Amino acid sequence: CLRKRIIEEQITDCTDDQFQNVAANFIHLIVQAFHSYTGNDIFALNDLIDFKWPKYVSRITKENIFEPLALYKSAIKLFLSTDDNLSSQTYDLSIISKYLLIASYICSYLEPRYDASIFSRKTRIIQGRAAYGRRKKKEVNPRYLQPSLFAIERLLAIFQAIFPIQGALREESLMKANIEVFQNLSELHTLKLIATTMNKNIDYLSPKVRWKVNVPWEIIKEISESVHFNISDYFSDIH
Amino acid sequence: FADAQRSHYTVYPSLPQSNKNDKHIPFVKLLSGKESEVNVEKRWELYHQLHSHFHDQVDHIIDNIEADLKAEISDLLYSETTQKRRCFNTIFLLGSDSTTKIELKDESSRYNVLIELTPKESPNVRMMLRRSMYKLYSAADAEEHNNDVSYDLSLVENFKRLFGKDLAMVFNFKDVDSINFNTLDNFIILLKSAFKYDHVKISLIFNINTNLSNIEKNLRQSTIRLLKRNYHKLDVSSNKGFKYGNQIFQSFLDTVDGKLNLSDRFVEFILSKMANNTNHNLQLLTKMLDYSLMSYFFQNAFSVFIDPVNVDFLNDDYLKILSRCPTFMFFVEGLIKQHAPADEILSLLTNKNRGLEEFFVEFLVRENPINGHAKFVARFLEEELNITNFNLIELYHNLLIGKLDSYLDRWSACKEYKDRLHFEPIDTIFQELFTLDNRSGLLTQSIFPSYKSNIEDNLLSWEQVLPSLDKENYDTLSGDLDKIMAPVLGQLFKLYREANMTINIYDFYIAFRETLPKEEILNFIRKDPSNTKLLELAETPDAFDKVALILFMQAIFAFENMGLIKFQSTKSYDLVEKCVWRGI
Amino acid sequence: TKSASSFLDTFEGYFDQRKIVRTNAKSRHTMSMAPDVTREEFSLVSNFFNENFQKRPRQKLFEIQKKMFPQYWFELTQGFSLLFYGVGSKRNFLEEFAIDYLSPKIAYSQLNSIPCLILNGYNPSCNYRDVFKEITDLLVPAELTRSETKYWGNHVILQIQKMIDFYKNQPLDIKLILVVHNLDGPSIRKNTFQTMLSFLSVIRQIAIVASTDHIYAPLLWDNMKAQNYNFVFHDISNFEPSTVESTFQDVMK
Amino acid sequence: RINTIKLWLKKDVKNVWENLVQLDFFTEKSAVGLRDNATAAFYASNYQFQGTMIPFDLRSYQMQIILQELRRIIPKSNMYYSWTQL
Amino acid sequence: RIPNSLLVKKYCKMTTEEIIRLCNDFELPREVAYKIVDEYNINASRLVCPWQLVCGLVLNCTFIVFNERRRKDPRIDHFIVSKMCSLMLTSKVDDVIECVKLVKELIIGEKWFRDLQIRYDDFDGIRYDEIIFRKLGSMLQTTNILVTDDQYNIWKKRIEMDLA
């Protein structure tokens, strides 16, 4: 890939030293650029050299082989970020499964007492009082920890609170949990996104098997960006 | 008896030898029992012709996606090399369910084996290795036309001298989102040492049903940098690139081309239920269209008139049924309101049967091509315009509504073609007996029902399921009880709904005890002529409570295995917890 | 009266009735003060009230839904499985539907009768290996060869997969009617039983007629189980006294 | 206080985190190491532990080397040496 | 001052004379009036506004007493709700649409609602022989893609006078 670049660019001011010096300079560039990333491991440097080599040969033009600094200033993009991952959208799921993931993320990080202050919105007819909410915001940031464990009725209740409107008085537009909601919930349990206390071959239909999410925040933010759900102001009263 | 105490008792039902009728088809007599038997036989044969013509195309599309996918995967599985030569080829099959057969090519003087691996076939690393080398030695020594080896990578080391051929094993992990990635990267590390043997070629194929940011988050980074050597991605999902929804819905129109029509509400219900499910949509398309066809030929007698030979069997009741179509009412109101010929509307109103009997057979030569023009819009968007991201179902929905121009300007690529891609159709009289439709909520009630809501509705209200009677009360055993007393397990739910989250079973018993009649059941309990035990407990001065606890405990231990009640505090079982709420 | 709830049952009825109740407002009443009975007084008044409280309206309801049976046979013979959810015992419905109505009609139409494998799935002694033993002599399929069996695999699931690829080259007539009572019962709701019963419903030559009792039932089936069943759901809730199954469960004091 | 230290993003601190469990600077919460005999290393090879099924950045690890023992062994001419006090 | 609405005024004292006037405005019978004024004794203290419960009562118990009257024409279907919207000094018809929904599950398994729905054979609008074949999912149920059998002949009778 370099020995075709020397003839693609019509380069005749070269010898073997003029190749090995830019080779050793590239290796020192990967070292002083990425040693704080890897560590003292030859294997994590060998593959970085294998990745970033032809994208570095594609930046020599006619006289970058003579200088050491403007070639580094011609390829500063591949010495700041590592670029090792395997790379638009976030998840190829349904709408109700995305909202089920969001609602399971909500109920397994929120304390169960403070939801009638965040979701209860309809006009009363009978004398009742809502939840006051938490007085002091706790700054321990609960979404750093492991999640909590909830019953499936709390997931179905928070699911129809955060769901968008669907559907002139026989509609009753507040969506009830049909077959498709339970089927998508079992699909989420199959895809290891919501999960539970794994007793060996657990029964789903027990009132002693509780559920939890095991997807991190960094994908829930992309999901809530996809369905355009304001979830950043749901954990605003913690940090 | 004692046959409902053992699991799986098979039972042969004996049968009468013959009844000698035509009751070999389930199609009942329609038109409130006035239809002819030969028309019912022709309706059954016609439905079977339609259903066979549909499913013979559905099966070709479904067995053509495999011939497309085997052609797709086996081109980026081969015909390429990497200069490092110490890497495995990796193919990430995104969105794929583990249902595909993989074919490996000839490539002689080289074996090609496929090692399918499963989250049940992988509890740790050694079972993966033993199953993989077992499948390798089996598919190597049975594709040859004798000693026993150990199932580890030594067989991969001396495969060149055991058989004489070079190895090229292609691994295949079925549910990659369901295996431990901690076991999977250990297996990839254990496979990485096979690179030094100069006759192997490992290829990895990952069948992922989620996104790629959830596989390279759970794996370790050295394995990810090993997998970044020759990786390719491939989106395998029948919602990407709407080609197989534009061949199942296209082929459904080729069966109903002129005979049947689709409603607006039906196609938007199809679009609403196909969008709330992503993994399998080529099956939820067909099992909605077939159940729409099955609820049509079972219900509509006029399906016998969708063939143009049965036009002469217009009896009087067919003329009664077709006359009360509101589109015909709109047509007759038109014949009144624009001009006034008397003795033609006086004929066709209720008196003349011949004019209405011959008038309807003119209304079947008409086509008015919705599905005959929609294929032109499909061919225009695919061939002349080259846009392959359109949905034939949603384009057909907007074409059926009439706001097709908004859907064509949704792309802003065919601004010079909004006249060429335009079509404004009208309605033909007597559509509303010839339309597949859902206005009764039938495809909702029996394919995607609100299950828990139906259970709670039948538990709470219960008058929409149990009748009320006005004659059968004196020959019975409980005639005055069906009108003054709710059924137990349906009366207890009225107290379960308006209870708290923690229900004390004694208070839940007292609230059930004072919603029963007292001076009726103490008279009712002495009715039995045969037995004598039921009357002496009525001679006990505490009969009402001892008959009330039996019904209460029966209803409580009947709710409990239905799922509405959790007995907390084991070794007490006294304070139950309400765990199902209505309306959710 | 004993609930101060502002809302009733919706999501806000869930959030409202889940409050916190103090120690003196609570009613800690043991059910010992309920007037105790014998086992035989329960056994007597139970079987009295089963068939002598709403007997004629329930028989009227069964005759109302008994003219629905040709639609059930049509849905079975067109490929679907059936699922009968509802309040009350669906047992005698499937004993009077699948034994009496269904298999005579299937046996006549393809011209002994069609074998009916009842399966008491409310009994917790319901293994799938002896049930699949009972299937493999009513059909008698081929055995698992050496190449088609795998390294310590499950032989039942591989045999059903072999039967699935065998029965794609066959005439489409019902060869068995598999009648599952309480499909979400305590030993059949587990995963490998449902993998068995979901792979059996892929075969067109067996008609699955199931019934459920629990209310969170449809989450036993994901996009692979609910696709291989292709259920059609029929609410036949008929308020039955349900006394065949309650002898299994604990009726403890 | 001030030429500086480049803040590496959490996409690159994952490799550093994995390189400090392959040098035994962190253990898991209660993870016993090699089992005593050969059967208890078999009985646990068929067990699927809960600490490896949860996501990566929630595994509750545990220190091998406390901050007091880190204070005395890092040289005092370091730019993080003041940060080893608490 | 002008009134904004009537279902706004919290804790307004309502006597039984106003309730029987509102019942005799809708010509509802005696045995439903003697439940609408007798339920007010039950939940009287726990009332945030008593012009919403009595408002929704006389459309929930109005749709069930005149069910066959609505099946022939939809003008009464707007007449009763517009009469209640102008009787409650309300400009928005949606605020009395929400009234019967907020009060409808408050009286769903009540006693007098239970033996008053069977009296007129309402069962949520659709009678028993039409709803028991809709709960079972029967394909032989009456979908309304045609017009009703007692309605086609009255559509016929309004044509013979437009030509004679």
Residue numbers in the entry:
A (entry chain E): 214 to 300, 319 to 398, 407 to 478
B (entry chain C): 15 to 159, 178 to 616
C (entry chain B): 233 to 343, 356 to 497
D (entry chain D): 425 to 426, 446 to 529
E (entry chain F): 267 to 430
What wording appears in the published article?
The S. cerevisiae ORC binds to specific DNA sequences throughout the cell cycle but becomes active only when it binds to the replication initiator Cdc6. Here we report the cryo-EM structure at 3.3 Å resolution of the yeast ORC–Cdc6 bound to an 85-bp ARS1 origin DNA.
The six AAA+−containing subunits (Orc1-5 and Cdc6) of ORC–Cdc6–DNA are arranged in a two-tiered, spiral structure that encircles the origin DNA, with the top tier formed by the AAA+ domains and the lower tier by the WHD domains. On the top tier, the gap between the Orc1 AAA+ and the Orc2 AAA+-like domain vacated by the Orc2 WHD became occupied by the Cdc6 AAA+ domain, and the AAA+ domains of Orc1-5 and Cdc6 form a nearly flat ring that encircles the ACS region of the origin DNA. Indeed, four ATPγS molecules and their associated Mg2+ were identified in the AAA+ domains of Orc1, Orc4, Orc5, and Cdc6. Therefore, the ORC–Cdc6 complex bound and stabilized 50 bp of the ARS1 origin DNA, which is 9 bp longer than that of ORC alone, which stabilized 41 bp of the ARS305 origin. Cdc6 was found to interact extensively with dsDNA in a bipartite manner, with the ISM of its AAA+ domain binding to the middle of the ACS sequence and the WHD hairpin motif binding to the intervening region between the A and B1 elements. The positively charged residues K477, K479, K481, and K483 in the Cdc6 WHD hairpin motif interact with the ACS phosphate backbone, but do not insert into the DNA groove, and therefore most likely increases the affinity of the ORC–Cdc6 complex for DNA. Our structure shows that Cdc6 binding stabilizes the Orc6 TFIIB-B domain, which in turn binds and stabilizes the eight nucleotides following the B1 element. We found that Cdc6 binding shifted a helix-turn-helix (HTH) motif in Orc1 by about 5 Å to form a part of the ATP binding site of Cdc6. In fact, the Orc1 Arg-616 points to the γ-phosphate and serves as the arginine finger in trans for the ATP molecule in the Cdc6 pocket.
